[PDB]
């Protein structure tokens, strides 16, 4: 979790570096245990006919979080990516924390973050709604509309092109705020009924199936590793459907 040994970190976009550090700091003092990705994946690289893609993976678990996945990637020299999801244990009914930053030579092109619902009514639990509303509406100059598969995201979802350093920092601070709310709610969550656990499991399955429709991720993976590898990676490593 200490990113001091990361090969990629020193070379990544500064907003990605700050967000990676914030996520790792959020996790550092939790009751962590390792989570073994398929084939005990850590670092991987690939190339076909174009640029090489390099990926670093860290993954943990706690009693409240089934799988806490932080991934850093770089395609060639330009394109830097941070991907993070905390997949909840359905027993506790917590939402899904996720974020993705994509950056190039010209700066950050996409910054997305959310606490995504798992309830059948598509709403965050009441305590989250309350705490999130109290943060206020953040202002960003260049909002982006989610694609249709993004119906999975809550009304608090951020999806922007940051306009300047102030907005980069405002976005990272809001992600820190989401993490602080999420970690707090994890300590007050009670184990739920079997019917409720089942409901939350279904919401998490749906979230993964929709995230797998994102061709932006798929094309990056395919250009470096090919179709079969990308399908395995998206369905088994990034967005595994629990069952």
Q: Which residues bind ligand BLA (CB under 6 A)?
A: 71, 73, 81, 83, 85, 98-100, 102, 109-110, 112, 114, 146-147, 150, 159, 214, 216-217, 220-221
The CB-of-73 to ligand BLA minimum distance in angstroms stands at 5
Return the number of other C-beta atoms located less than 10 Å from residue 31's C-beta. Answer: 9
Give me the count of residues in the chain: 243
Nearer to ligand BLA, 30 or 81 (CB): 81
Partners of 82 in the beta sheet? 72, 101
Nearer to ligand BLA, 112 or 179 (CB): 112
The CB-of-99 to ligand BLA minimum distance in angstroms stands at 5
The CB-of-48 to ligand BLA minimum distance in angstroms stands at 15
Nearer to ligand BLA, 31 or 106 (CB): 106
Beta-carbon contacts of 206 under 8 Å, excluding residues fewer than 6 positions away, are 152
Distances (CA, A) of 162 to 2, 96, 111: 27, 23, 7
In degrees and rounded to multiples of 5, residue 87 shows phi and psi of -90, 125
Nearer to ligand BLA, 50 or 191 (CB): 50
Nearer to ligand BLA, 102 or 183 (CB): 102
The CB-of-221 to ligand BLA minimum distance in angstroms stands at 6
The CB-of-129 to ligand BLA minimum distance in angstroms stands at 19
The CB-of-81 to ligand BLA minimum distance in angstroms stands at 5
**With helix as H, strand as E and coil as C, how does 91-130 read?**
HHCCCEEEEEEEEECCEEEEEEEEEECCCCCCCCCHHHHH
The CB-of-191 to ligand BLA minimum distance in angstroms stands at 26
Measured distance CA(123)–CA(239) in Å, rounded: 21
Contact (CB, 8 A) for 89 and 204: no
Q: Which two tokens stand for residue 224?
A: 């470096």
3-state class (DSSP) for residue 58: strand
DSSP class of 212: T
Contact (CB, 8 A) for 100 and 81: yes
Nearer to ligand BLA, 100 or 186 (CB): 100
Nearer to ligand BLA, 184 or 216 (CB): 216
Contact (CB, 8 A) for 146 and 214: no
């Amino acid at each position: 979790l200490s990113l001091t040994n990361s090969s990629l970190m020193p070379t990544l976009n500064p907003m990605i570096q700050q967000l990676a550090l914030a996520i790792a700091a959020s996790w550092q003092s939790l009751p962590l245990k390792p989570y073994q990705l398929p084939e005990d994946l850590g670092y991987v690289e690939g190339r076909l006919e174009g640029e090489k893609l390099v990926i670093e993976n860290r993954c943990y678990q706690t009693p409240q979080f089934r799988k806490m996945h932080l991934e850093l990637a770089k395609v060639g020299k330009g394109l830097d990516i941070l991907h993070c999801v905390m997949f909840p244990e359905p027993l506790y009914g917590l939402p899904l924390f996720g974020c993705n930053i994509v950056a190039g030579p010209g700066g950050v092109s996409a910054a997305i973050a959310d606490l995504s619902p798992t309830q059948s009514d598509r709403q965050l639990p009441a305590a989250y709604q309350k705490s999130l509303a109290e943060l206020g509406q953040p202002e960003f100059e260049q909002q982006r509309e989610l694609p249709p598969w993004g119906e999975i995201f809550s009304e608090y979802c951020l999806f922007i092109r940051p306009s300047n350093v102030t907005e980069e920092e405002r976005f990272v601070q809001r992600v820190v705020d989401f993490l602080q709310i999420h970690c707090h709610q994890s300590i007050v969550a009670e184990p739920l009924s079997e019917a409720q656990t089942l409901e939350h499991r279904q919401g998490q399955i749906h979230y993964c199936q929709q995230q797998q429709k994102n061709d932006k991720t798929r094309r990056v993976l395919e250009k470096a590793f090919g179709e079969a590898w990308a399908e395995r990676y998206m369905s088994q490593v990034l967005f595994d459907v629990i069952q």
